[model samples]
Target chain A: MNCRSEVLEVSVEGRQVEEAMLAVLHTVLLHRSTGKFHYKKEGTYSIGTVGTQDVDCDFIDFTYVRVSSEELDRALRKVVGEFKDALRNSGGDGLGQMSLEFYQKKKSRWPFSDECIPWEVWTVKVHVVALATEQERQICREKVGEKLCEKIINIVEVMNRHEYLPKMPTQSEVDNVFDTGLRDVQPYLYKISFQITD
Target chain B: SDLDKFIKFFALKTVQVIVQARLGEKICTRSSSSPTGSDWFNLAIKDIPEVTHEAKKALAGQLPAVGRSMCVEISLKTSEGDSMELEIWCLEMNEKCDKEIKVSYTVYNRLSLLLKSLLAITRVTPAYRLSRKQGHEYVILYRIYFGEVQLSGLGEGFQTVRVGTVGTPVGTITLSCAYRINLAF
Candidate 1:
C-alpha cells in the first residue's frame, strides 16, 4: 500500500508542552489500534473494538479520549518525559516537531537484512511559549488544551481517509506488522521521532 | 482624567481595526475603505494609517508610565475571500505568548464573548465563570506564530502571532499588558 501521512501544528505556553505531545500521540494511537485481531477462514481478519477512556486535563478546559491501558500509557510517556527534559535543559529553540510512524518489517533472504517500511505517519509541530502577564498566562493554560482538542477531532474525523493498512499475516511467525506485546491493545509497529529548530 | 478615556478608546479602536480586517464589511467602523469587506483575496490589507498613526502619535506625546508589551499580528487572505488574523501579545520580555485573540466564521461568537471578558484590562480573564457547554464542538487552533516586522525608532517594534479552526482558522485580537515600566510623577 502507498504510504500516507497527516500533519498538524499547535502553539502552547511551556506548561502545555508535555500534555500537548502526549495528547496527540495517544489520540492517533487509539484511533489506529484495536483490542485484538480475529483471523477468519476466508483469508481475512476482523479487528476488535478499541477500549477507550474520557480524560480531563488539568490545564485545559476540554476533555479528550485516550486508550485505557496503564501499561501502554506509562510506556509512551517515559520517552516523551525524557525528551521534555532535554527541551527544558538544552532546547534553545522554541519550535519543535515530533512524528509517529507505523510500519512493517519485510523479511529478507538469508544474505540480506530485514527492512522496515513506513506505511503511515502522523506529525505534530509545536511552538512552545510563555506569556507575559499572570491572567493571560492562566488563559493560555486552557487555550493550549482547547487547541489539542481540535487536533484530536481532526484526527478522528480523518478515519476513512487512511482506510488501507498492512494485511493480516497467514502464519504466526510472519505476523510482525503489529506489536502484540501490549496486554490490552494491539497497535501497529510504530516509532516516535522528534526535532527542534531555532 | 481624559487619559483613562484615551486608553480605552485607543484599545477599542485598535480592536475595531482588527475586527474590521478579519470580518471585513460585516462590522465596519467606517463605511468606506479601499480593500476590505467585499474586497477579493490576496488583498494586501494596507495598514490602517489613521489607527497606526494615532497610536504612534499617542506614544510620541509621552504618556505616563503604565507598561510595555509586544504585539504580533499576522493576517492571511485565503480562497473564497475568507480572511483570517491571529494577534498575540508577548506581554513579557520572555517572548512567550501571553494573550491571544481570534475571529472567524466559527470563532466570531467566541471572540465576541472574550471581548466582553475584559479585553480592555490588559486583556484579562474573568477568572471564575469560564464555562464548557455540553456537546459543544470547540475548535482547536494549531498555528505557526511567525514574526513579521521591526520599526527603526526606539519607541517601535513588534513580534508575531498565529492561527487555526475546525479544518483551518480565523482572525483574532488580543492586548495583554506587561513589560518595560517607566516611572513618572
Candidate 2:
C-alpha cells in the first residue's frame, strides 16, 4: 500500500522597505498636487522658487512603521479612498475631472526648470481580484478599466503641455512612454498548485 | 535583535517559495545545518513529478527576479559575500533565458543542451535549487548551500542597455518565492 500527501508553505516579507518608501513618495506627490498635504516637508523637492531644492536631503520623510501585508493592503486602500474623497470634496460625478496640470505641477522635481532632464511621475492603479462571480469581475474590468485608463491618459497627454517647453514630443519619445514599464512599489500575490502522483 | 529579524524574514521567504512551486515534504524541511555552523533552513525536493522540460522552461522564465531577491536578502543579512556572484548568476541566467522568452524548437534544443552542461557540473549550485524544473531555469526556490557563507562583495557585471535611460532602480520586487536561510550571527 502507498500513501500520498502534499504540503503548501508560503513565506512573505509582507512589506518591503524600499517599496513602502516609494509608495509614500507617490502619495505625497498626489496630495501635494491637490493642496491637501499629509506627509511632512510638503515642498521639500517641489521647486527652488517655492522652496529650496536640495537634490540631497530635501526628499520627504515618511515616518517608518513596521509594514505587513495587511499594512500594504490598508495603504493602497487608503490611496483609493483619498482619491475618491478628493473627488467628493471638490464637489463628482459631484466634482468634475481634476486638472492634469495640477498633477503635472506636483510630479516635476523642479516644475519651474526649463532644462531638467530625466523626470519622475507617479501613477496609482487599483486592482480588484478574487471576485465572487465572473459577472462581478467582468463588471469591474469594464468599470475600473475605463476610469483608470482615462486617468493615465490625462497624465500622459500633458507630456508636451508645458508653457515654456517645446510643444512636440519626438516619435521615439512617445514610443518610449508606451514601451517603457515603470516599477510599482506595491504588494504582488500569486498562487501556484502542484500535484504529485505515484 | 537584527539577527533574529533577518533570520525570521529569510525563513518566511524560503517557505513561501516552496509553497508557490507546490513542492512536497520530501524536498522541504524546516531545519538543516551548514558546514559553517550557521543555520541552514532546509528545502530540498527530489523527483517532483512536475519536473519536465516544459516545466523547467516555464520556471526559468520566472527566476531572474526571484534569484535577485534571494541574493539581496542574503546580502542584507550578512552584509557581504556573493552579492556580485548572485548578480552575475542572474545576468548569465537571463542571457540563457532568451530561449524561454522566444519559444521555438531550436531554442528548446539549446535549453536541452544547456541542461546537459549544467548536469555535468556538480560544483556550487547558485542560490536556487538546480534540479527542480529539470534544473535548467535556475529558478531559485531559496535555500542555497554556502560553506560558511560570508558577507563580502562578490565581483558582478551589469548590462547597460542605454545610458540615457539610467536612473536609480529602487524598491523590493518581492515575489511569492524562496530564499536559502543563512545570515550574520
Candidate 3:
C-alpha cells in the first residue's frame, strides 16, 4: 500500500464527446507545428513544443471548432476549469508528487520567461476505445484504420507537400492549404471489446 | 519560401505519427473482440493431441480469406511426433482485424541493435496477419510505438514494457497486421 501506482480510468467511451476530443487532437497536433505550440503531459509539471522555433498561442485568439468533436467541449470546460482552480488553490494532484512553485520576483506566477521554450518534442497519442460486438468491431477496424486515418494522413500529406514547392501559390494560398490542418474531422477508433466481467 | 518549407516538414511529421498510432490502435481493438477471440485464449491451452489430427484435417482444405480472414501460420506436432500445420488463414471469418503490420524481430526483439540494423529489411506488411495473434505480434508493435497487438500474455513477455490490459484489451483490436518492412543495411 505504501508504493502503489495509481490507475486513472478516464472514460473514453463511444460517446460523441470522446469522439469530438479525438477529432480536435488530430487537428491541434497536425497544425501544432505551425503556431507557437506547447503542451503539458497528462500529469506532469513539464511542457514541450514541436516546431524548431518557439510556438506560442494568442490565448483567447484560438478556435476550438478548428479541430472537431463534442469532446472538445468537455476539454474546454475541464482544462480551463483546472487552470482557474490551480491558480486559486495550491497546485497538487493529491499524490503530493507535484509541488507548487513560488517565484522569487514573479510572485505566484510561473517563474520561467513567459516565452522560454523548454523541451523539444511535444507529440502524443490520444487512444479512444468503444466496446462493441464482433461485427461492429470489424466496421470500426476498417473505418478507423485505412479508410479514416489513412485518408486523413493522405490529405494532410498533400498539404505538407505543398509546403515544399508552392505551385502558383501565395501567402493566402499557403494559409488556405494549411487551413485544412483542422477542416476534415472524424471519430477515431480507440478500443472495442466485449464486457467479459460484471 | 522559407515559411512554406518549415510548414511542410512539420505537417508531414504529424501525419506520420498520427497515422501510425491510430492505425495500430484500430487493429488491436478489432482482433481482441472476435468470436475467434477464443483463438487467442486457445494459444495458452497447449495444443492438445487427439484434436491434432482433426484440427489439421479441418485446416488442409484450400484456405480462403472468407472462411477466416485472420490466420496465424503455425507448426504443431502430434502425440505420435507427427508434424502437422495450421496456417493462420484457416481461422478467417468475420475477421475483426482491420489492418496488420508484420515487423521483424530485429527492430522489435533487438532494439539495442536498432541503429546497427537500421537499414535492415524489417517486416511491414501494409496488410498481412498470421492465422493467430501472439505475444510477439504486440511486442514488436508496442516497442516501435506503431500499432496495437491484442494478445493475453503481452505483459509477462517483456520487462519495463508499458504493459496495458494484460488479460483484457486496453485499446482497440480492429487490427489488420499492416507491414512497414524494408531491407536491412
Number of the top candidate by DockQ? 2
- Can you give the TM-score per candidate against the true fold? 0.49, 0.21, 0.22
Q: Which scores greater on lDDT, model 1 or model 3? A: 1
On lDDT, the leading prediction is: 1
Interface root mean square deviation per prediction: 21.4, 23.3, 19.0
Worst 10 residues of 2 chain A by lDDT: A46-55
lDDT tens per residue, model 3, B55-174: 334334322223332222222333344432221111112233332322221112111111111101011122112212323323112121111222322123221111011010111111
Ten residues in sequence with the least summed lDDT for candidate 3 chain B: B115-124
Q: Give lDDT for model 1.
A: 0.47
Ranking by DockQ: 2, 3, 1
| Chain B TM-score for the candidates in order | 0.23, 0.24, 0.19
Which residue ranges in model 3 land beyond 4 Å of their true spot? Answer: A1-21, A33-134, A161-198, B1-185
Residue B2's lDDT within candidate 2 is: 37
Best by TM-score: 1
Q: DockQ of each model against the real complex?
A: 0.01, 0.03, 0.02
Alpha-carbon deviation at B87 in model 1, angstroms: 30
The sequence of per-residue lDDT tens digits that candidate 1 reaches over residues B88-143 is 32211222322342323123222222222211121111111111221122211112
Q: What is the lDDT of residue A148 in candidate 2?
A: 27
Better of 2 and 3 by DockQ: 2
Q: Can you write out model 3's per-residue Cα lDDT over A1-198, one digit (the tens) per residue?
A: 011111112212233222323333333232322211122343211111111111111211111112222342344346434433332244332111111111112113345563322111111222235556767655554344323233223323332222121121133333322222321221111111111111
